[PDB]
Structures are given as C-alpha cells and as structure tokens.
Design a protein around this ligand. Structure first.
Ligand code: FMN
Ligand code: SF4
Ligand code: FES
Ligand code: CL
Ligand code: CL
Ligand code: CL
Ligand code: CL
Ligand code: NA
Lengths: 155, 416
C-alpha cells in the first residue's frame, strides 16, 4: 500500500512538527480518516514505518480512540451528542429529523456511503443543546428544514 | 476561516477572562494588543521565575480543571525537581455540561497563550503543549494560527523580549477519549500511546512527559495568570473571597432561560447562578436538582451554597446542569451511568465491570425489566466501582448516582 503524494506530504508534516515523530500519531490518523473517510487497515503498516513505531502499537492506538473508524467508509460523519443535557433538550428530535432526511439511524451509513450517524458523548456545547457535528463543523439542531439546509452543503 | 461552531452565550460581572470572550468571535493578536494584551508577559519577564510562583501562590489561584489544587504550590513542587521541565495546557474538556474552556480558546486564544508563556517561564519549561480534544477542530486551528501570530510578534521563539527565555508551544489533538483529560493519560496520549492513566506515584510534577517534571494546568487556570501578574496578587485576592479568589467561569445548561457561560466570583451562591444570572428556570418550573457535571448531584435544598472549593462549596469545575420538577432523576442517572460506561479505559477490573454493570442494570431498572436481584446488584455495583482504581474516574463513576439514591429516594422507589 502507498499513500498518495498529497496525503503523504501532510503526514510527513505532522511527523516533523513534534520533537518526536511518534507524538504525531493522532494527527496522522486524523489525516488518514479525512482523506479516505475511514482508516484503511492496510494504511497502518506504512504509517507505523513513518512513525518508527511497531505495527501493533499503531493498531492498538486506532482501536482505543473512539473517533477513528476502521470498518465504515463515509464522506461525512454526523456526530450526534447523546449525553445528558442534549438528551434533556431533545436529542431524539434531531435523530428523528436525520431519519426523515437520510433514512438512517445511529451507527448506520447511507447506501450512498456518504453519511454515517455517529452517536457521541458530550460535545462541550450543552447550552446550545441539542448539538451535532458534520465532520469538523458543529451546529445546534433547531428544525428539520434547517438540518436539511445544513446537510445540503455537503455533497 | 474556521469550522463552524455554536454561538454560546457569555456574560461577565468582572470583565476579566470574558473581557473579549464575551463576544463570540476570534480576537486576533492586533485586537488583543490594542486591548492591553501581552503587557503581563512583559512585566513577568522582568520578574524572576520564583517571584512569579510566589505571586501565583499568594493569589490563592486554584486549579479550575476539577481538583481545585493550589496552582502556585503545584509549580513549587515541580521546580523542586531538576529540569528540563514541560508545561502542558489541558484542553480536553469532555465532561457532560462543561463548555467553559472552549470560549476562551475559540474567542480569546492570546489570553491562554500569554498565560502559557508566563507559566512556562515560571517553572523553567522551554517546551509547552496544548492537548485539545479532537472534537474541537476549530479550537485547534484557532490556536495554531494564534501561536504563529504570537511567534511573528516575538512573544514565542528564542530570547523572548530579550529575556533570554526560549519557548515553543505545540498543539496536540485528542481522538475521542474522555480519559485523556486525566493528567497521566493525557501525557500517555502526548507520547503517542493509548490514553491509559499511569499508576501514581510518581506524580507528573516529578515524572511526567518523557519522565521529566511536568506541570499540567487547565485552560481556565492558565487564563488567570496574566491577571495575577497584571493586577498583582493583592488586587487579585480582593476579587471574590480572600479564601478562593479570582473570576470563575460557570457553564450553565439545562432548563434555565439563559444557558451559557457566566464569569462570576466564587462567593456567588448556586441559587444566584440559576435565578439572578441565568434568568431562573424555563417556564418558572421548580428546580429539582443540579448536576455538577457528572460528579455530584445537589437537591433544591442545597442551592444556598457558594460556588467555591470550600468543604460545603459546589466545587468541581462549576458546571451547572439544571433539572426541573418535570425531569425524571432515574432517566438522568442513566445518562450519567451511560457516560461512565463509555469512558472507562478498562485497565482496572472493578471500574471496567462496574461502569458497564451500573449502566446495564440501571437501564433494566428504567425499562422496568429489573428483578429484585438486579436492584440489589445495582446497589452493590454502584458502591464497588472504585476498588483498585488507579485514576479518579473509577472513584467518582458511582458518586452522582449514589447521591440521587440518597437525595431522591421516592423517585427510585416508584421504579421498584
Ligand atoms: C476522568 C478525568 C477527566 C479529567 N478531565 C479533565 C479535563 O477535561 N480538563 C482538565 O483540565 N482536567 C481534567 N481532569 C483533571 C486533570 O487530571 C488535572 O487535575 C488538571 O488538568 C490539573 O490542572 P488544574 O490544577 O489547573 O485544574 C480530569 C481528571 C479525571 C480523573
Ligand atoms: S479507574 Fe477506570 S478509567 Fe481510571 S485507569 Fe482504572 S479502568 Fe481506566
Ligand atoms: S450534553 Fe450534548 S453538548 Fe454537552
Ligand atoms: Cl524521534
Ligand atoms: Cl457508531
Ligand atoms: Cl505592565
Ligand atoms: Cl488519584
Ligand atoms: Na426525557
């Protein structure tokens, strides 16, 4: 397996950034998920080499950290907060809208393979509950029509 | 241009930490300078490190990351150990209800940065790290840009303002583990490993990053340091009670009218936070309970306590989640149980199994599927998550839920 030049450039950048290469592991994994929509299993042996880490270490890191997905490819991840405050304020209303618009439930990927709904713990935006993200973007859920407009920005 | 972020409401009576961060926009370095910024750094660099530690000590500044440990003392303890030393800013803010640190990060990053440089000089660290949760991408990019701004202006790099002091600040991202907020797990993460808490001792201030003396401080704690240098410790001590001085950020959520962050003195009472500042309850409903994040549960009988770190004080991070009379405490307890289920790192058996079983059984209790033995089992498990635990998570995973059992016996009895 080979990283495309454009990705590999950014990975080497992260590796150069910290005083020790291994410290860049999460920046690298973040980068790989963004490029592919997930962490390809076959991506980890070349990563490890760039990191100068044993494959087993890199694999265990991927397993530990909840944001990294090794199974499902998805262009956009809709992280819906399922913690106390958002639950109080109306998480299930947001999930209902997502079901109406996308036809999928938490943990599922559209047959399109472009949206995955990812249930997450508190997003640190509780005053604006119910809260969700679309990849790096973060929003309060207000209404179905708003959610529609928001999701339409991602193609 | 940065990733979209919500507009969290903020209000202040002291106009210190939220002088700028009360407005929801990135305040870049020129606006920071125009507002008197980087004056404290200048003053600090004309002081000795030991003087800064003394001032911070005499300020009565306490950690705002949950444990309320005196900051000056932590610094003193660290510098008892030969350098090199590292300084770490903890920006993992992942506890339910807590959104106080991000508005500093995303709106007034130079306040934090100025704080980090002063704190780093104080303990003789030439290398600093911000560990920011992965779910704060905007915060990460804002901080990266701000650091480069400060570097351009000569507040970072070599020979900062001719002082002979060198500092670089690196920004690490988390990847979705609440346990990475715990200082040893954060350090494990920083070294590019799984966020497994280390057995203590040693404590980070002796052996931390690469086994070197390491000071970990919360975003909010560090954000106070410019004001201590600027005002002086005496004037800082006059803010709120001499006992627990300075501004504090209070992230207020739930069924209040005006949810947001409030900058208030810590002698403010809980009743004041909810009713005076946050505009009381939605629909003027009666307060049933206040969850201190995922740590404590205060009933409506405990509203006239101060928001300080005294024995009868609110304590914690000042996170205020307001439950009203219409809210089901068992349902709420389950959410808190669910949190701990999903965040235990699994290293310690009672934490591993306890966090799981507490949620599993509590869900059965709420669904009305629990047997008598399930109830007894839930009781036992709730009281037995802590044994053998090597971090604070195992020790507190059953705390809030237990308080709900004690303080709201009637509501639980219904489910029996
Ligand atoms: C489970 C757990 C999670 C924690 N999460 C955070 C966090 O998100 N932010 C933080 O600053 N401290 C957090 N802490 C506390 C830190 O370990 C540490 O007390 C603090 O960062 C020290 O800085 P301070 O003295 O300025 O508060 C956590 C502790 C535990 C046990
Ligand atoms: S107490 Fe729990 S969270 Fe802390 S190290 Fe042990 S298993 Fe992990
Ligand atoms: S509970 Fe959802 S953002 Fe905190
Ligand atoms: Cl190296
Ligand atoms: Cl999922
Ligand atoms: Cl000055
Ligand atoms: Cl401990
Ligand atoms: Na409910």
């Amino acid at each position: 397996f080979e990283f495309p030049e454009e990705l590999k450039t950014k990975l080497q950048e992260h590796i150069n950034y910290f005083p020790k290469k291994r410290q860049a592991i999460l920046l690298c994994l973040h980068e790989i998920q963004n490029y592919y929509g997930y962490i390809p299993p076959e991506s980890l042996k070349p990563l490890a080499d760039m990191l100068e880490l044993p494959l087993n270490h890199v694999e265990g890191v991927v397993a530990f950290y909840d944001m990294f997905d090794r199974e499902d490819k998805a262009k956009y991840r809709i992280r819906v907060c399922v913690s106390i405050v958002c639950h109080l304020m109306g998480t299930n209303k947001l999930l209902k809208a997502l079901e109406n618009i996308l036809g999928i439930k938490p943990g599922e990927v559209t047959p399109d393979g472009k949206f995955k709904i990812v249930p997450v713990q508190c997003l640190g935006a509780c005053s604006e509950a119910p809260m969700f993200m679309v990849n790096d973007d973060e929003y309060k859920f207000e209404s179905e029509v708003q959610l529609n407009e928001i999701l339409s920005r991602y193609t | 241009s940065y990733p979209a972020i919500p507009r969290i409401y903020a209000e202040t009576t002291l106009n210190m930490l939220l002088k700028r961060a009360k407005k929801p926009r990135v305040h870049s370095i020129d606006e920071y300078l125009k507002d008197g910024g980087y004056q404290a750094l200048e003053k600090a660099l004309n002081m000795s490190p030991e003087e800064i530690i003394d001032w911070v000590d005499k300020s009565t500044l306490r950690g705002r990351g949950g444990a309320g440990f005196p900051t000056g003392k932590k610094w003193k303890f660290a510098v008892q150990n030969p350098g090199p030393r590292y300084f770490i800013c903890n920006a993992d803010e992942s506890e339910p209800g807590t959104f106080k640190d991000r508005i500093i990060i995303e709106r007034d990053p130079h306040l934090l940065i100025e704080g980090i440089i002063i704190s780093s000089y104080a303990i003789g660290a030439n290398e600093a790290y911000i560990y920011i949760r992965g779910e704060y991408p905007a915060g990460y990019y804002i901080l990266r840009d701000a650091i480069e701004e400060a570097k351009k202006k000569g507040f970072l790099g070599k020979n900062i303002l001719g002082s002979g002091f060198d500092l670089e600040i690196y920004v690490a991202r988390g990847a979705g583990a609440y346990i990475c907020g715990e200082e040893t797990a954060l350090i494990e993460s920083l070294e590019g490993k799984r966020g497994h808490p280390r057995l203590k001792p040693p404590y980070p201030v002796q052996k931390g990053l690469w086994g070197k003396p390491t000071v970990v401080n919360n975003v909010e704690t560090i954000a106070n340091v410019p004001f201590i240098i600027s005002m002086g410790w005496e004037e800082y001590r006059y803010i709120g009670p001499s006992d627990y001085a300075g501004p504090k950020l209070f992230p207020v959520s739930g069924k209040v009218k005006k949810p947001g962050v409030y900058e208030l003195p810590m002698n403010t009472t809980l009743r004041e936070v909810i009713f005076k500042y946050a505009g009381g309850t939605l629909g003027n409903k009666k307060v049933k309970a206040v969850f201190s994040g995922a740590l404590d549960c205060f009933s409506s009988e405990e509203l006239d306590i101060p928001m300080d770190y005294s024995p009868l004080g609110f304590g914690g991070t000042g996170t205020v989640i307001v439950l009203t009379e219409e809210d089901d405490i068992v349902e709420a307890a389950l959410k808190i149980a669910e949190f701990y289920e999903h965040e235990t790192c699994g290293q310690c058996t009672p934490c591993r199994v306890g966090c799981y079983e507490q949620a599993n059984l509590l869900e059965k209790i709420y669904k009305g599927e629990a047997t008598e033995q399930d109830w007894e089992g839930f009781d036992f498990v709730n009281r037995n998550i802590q044994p053998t635990s090597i971090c604070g998570l195992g020790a507190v995973a059953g705390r809030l839920i237990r308080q709900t059992l004690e303080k709201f016996p009637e509501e639980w009895e219904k489910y029996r």
